[PDB]
Design an enzyme around this catalytic site. Sequence first.
Site, mmCIF file in Angstrom:
data_model
loop_
_atom_site.group_PDB
_atom_site.id
_atom_site.type_symbol
_atom_site.label_atom_id
_atom_site.label_comp_id
_atom_site.label_asym_id
_atom_site.label_seq_id
_atom_site.Cartn_x
_atom_site.Cartn_y
_atom_site.Cartn_z
ATOM 1 N N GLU B 33 0.738 -1.252 -0.058
ATOM 2 C CA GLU B 33 0.024 -0.022 -0.105
ATOM 3 C C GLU B 33 0.788 1.321 0.170
ATOM 4 O O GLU B 33 1.973 1.343 0.746
ATOM 5 C CB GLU B 33 -1.026 -0.037 1.125
ATOM 6 N N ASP B 94 9.186 5.613 15.832
ATOM 7 C CA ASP B 94 9.343 7.121 15.205
ATOM 8 C C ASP B 94 9.763 7.845 16.701
ATOM 9 O O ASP B 94 9.201 7.611 17.621
ATOM 10 C CB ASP B 94 7.941 7.362 14.975
ATOM 11 N N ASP B 96 11.008 11.877 18.093
ATOM 12 C CA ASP B 96 10.895 13.228 17.537
ATOM 13 C C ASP B 96 11.340 14.126 18.696
ATOM 14 O O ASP B 96 11.741 13.696 19.905
ATOM 15 C CB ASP B 96 9.488 13.624 17.345
#
EC number: 2.7.7.-
Lengths: 430, 352
Positions: B33, B94, B96
């Site tokens: 996808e 992830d 940050d």
Amino acid sequence: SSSEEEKKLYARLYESKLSFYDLPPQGEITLEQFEIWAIDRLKILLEIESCLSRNKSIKEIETIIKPQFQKLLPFNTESLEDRKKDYYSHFILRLCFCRSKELREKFVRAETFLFKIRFNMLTSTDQTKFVQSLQFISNEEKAELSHQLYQTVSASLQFQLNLNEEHQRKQYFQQEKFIKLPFENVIELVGNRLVFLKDGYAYLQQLNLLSNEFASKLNQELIKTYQYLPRLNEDDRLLPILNHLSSGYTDEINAQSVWSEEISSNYPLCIKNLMEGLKKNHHLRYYGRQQLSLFLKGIGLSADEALKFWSEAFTTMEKFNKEYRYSFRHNYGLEGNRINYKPWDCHTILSKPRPGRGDYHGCPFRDWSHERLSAELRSMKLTQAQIISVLDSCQKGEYTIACTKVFEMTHQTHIAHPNLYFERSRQLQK
Amino acid sequence: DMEYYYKSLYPFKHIFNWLNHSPKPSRDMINREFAMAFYKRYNSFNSVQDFKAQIEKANPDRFEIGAIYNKPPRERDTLLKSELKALEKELVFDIDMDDYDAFRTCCSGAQVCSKCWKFISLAMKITNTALREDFGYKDFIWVFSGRRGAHCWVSDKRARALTDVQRRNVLDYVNVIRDRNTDKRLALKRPYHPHLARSLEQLKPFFVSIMLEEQNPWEDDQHAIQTLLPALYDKQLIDSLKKYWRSSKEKWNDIDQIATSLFKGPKQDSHIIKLRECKEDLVLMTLYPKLDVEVTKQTIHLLKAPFCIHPATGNVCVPIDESFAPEKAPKLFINQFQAYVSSLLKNELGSV
Ligand code: SF4
């Protein structure tokens, strides 16, 4: 097959005191033993389910079920008959409970919990023997990772084995063996961090892994048995028994707190009378004993705490264990037909025989003279108008109305249950 | 600018080879996808040429990598919603700069630099240590998020086939700092897990150099009261330190001095042990990786593809090496990606 072959195959099947139930049993047993053994295991399993539905602790659960082991399906015995009882009972229930998915879930849950218990009372040597009977790490590999494994398992040992001292934990870790398995099979322990994880492998908390494997294998075998059941649908003998068995499925308050003023202030008059007579005479008679025991059960007093309170109130242990322990456990429904007896309500209390000399049971609003009742009310700081009101209620035979009045003045109005009285009194403080 | 970037500069062949896990096209790319942000989801490509042509034609600011399905996502309109089932996707992390802003003073807001990049770098070091020594993963790469973050892409076949339960368990194992509030003591479980003890041991040497000297966030008295004091356990010690209150180093030593002055007698050992535990907890709060929990939990989650352009700064989301810095990211690495993709392919053949 001969008797000697059967004995040898069985001794091979139970080289450890516990079994995984892999190979179906071989032999011929009567319909009598079939039904009796299936009923026995179903009774133990229903007891485990009832304990689960009450959120009881694990320790409390084995305390309740150990005598049921000694009675129905005795474990840790060298008798071949008991072992075959266990095996055939498990497989008979396997046959009975495989018809629907809900039944399979209930069966595997209860059986895996029973496995957890059975592994619990088995000794460390026996546990090691059963586990050996999933690769164990070598001694060198354990020594290389000894520090990290000890750090991982120290908290688990302290909290489960109650090894509060560090030296006991170290000694247990020295003898404890470990199994090298990947984290995909031990994810539930990985999330909680009960297993040391290295290079994609988790070093085993072994009981949880064993129980999960038991559940998976048991579910697969249940599905296979459901597949094979239509072939066994041809016999007239077993089908009614399987159908019957399938339908057969379908602390703040402690021994010292009930003596305290905080809890006793929420009692009704009758329970105060029983409690005070107990204190004076260090013994209560049958109707009073059952009344007070059932009330204490209703307010949440546990069976163990009830036993401690009843033993300490009766200031020898021999006669106690002989004559009153069984009654005080049976009020809680732990033996016989196991009736979790409902606490007596005011109608049940008033339906009992009228108390006499030395008898404290009944209702004080009915059995006490108006003078003694009046004095007990003055002890509760009740004014004369209130005393006249409750005496008028008593004179009409409305003892429950008088008790409700006493509750209201001392603290859905009507109260027809001492436990309801206590619960509402506790609510007024909550 | 984006048209030229996708026409000439974006490495389409290399991304295709990385995602297909095979030099020849397979279902790993046909059924994978792709989501495009201009938000059009469920796109898939049959070849490198088709990938490049569709990206050039649509011209998105960025596109994100999805999971591998049983059927092509581009034909979802012809398929039932229950027919498209997710099979595999690279395990993703992830990190940050947002969760460390209470502990940095060089940059304010959304700014980043090499000084505050030490938090991110230590996060990569700890996560890589966990994945390598614990999970045994070998084919993982770290990609700059574009402005101040880093993305990890674990391409191990075992990691790719992980279920959502396994991914959640892995994240829970790694995400030790579940509560990100700086006004409350962590009160981490004792004794420390070997992973936690190892992470604390690696983060200890950098703690002084970053926090107490280079960042110096507790030099402000109000900042100290807000963050450093709540990391303590004793109310009397907190009150005494507040009354006494210096750079972060002076306050750090004052904590020990006041604790020694206050706690005396046979019970002093428990108090010093508790203070040391609280100091380790604060070190972990300051330096431990603070992952984004959502992107890792599920296989169907979409994460920004490598070599994408950040819309705000123009930085290209390049892979991160040991010497990478936010300033080193070029504005609108390929060979490093070649080495990583080749190693992944040989490891995949070995697993086969
Ligand atoms: S009315 Fe009921 S609760 Fe009240 S004293 Fe009589 S028996 Fe006990």
